[PDB]
Design a protein around this ligand. Structure first.
Ligand SMILES: [Zn+2]
Lengths: 19, 29
């Protein structure tokens, strides 16, 4: 009926940067 | 040091949405 209201992120935080 | 098991199986809560972030569970059977 309804799944556990857990994390629903369209891009989880990963150990990395952007530079 | 010490085991990192303190959340229904060393789970962590994603502060991003407050909803618990669990890992793919496909073993144990
Ligand atoms: Zn999340």
């Amino acid at each position: 009926r309804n799944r556990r209201r857990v994390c629903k992120c369209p891009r989880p935080v990963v150990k990395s940067g952007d530079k | 040091s010490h085991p990192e098991d303190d959340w229904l199986e060393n789970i962590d809560v994603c502060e991003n949405c407050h909803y618990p972030i669990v890992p793919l569970d496909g073993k144990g059977t």
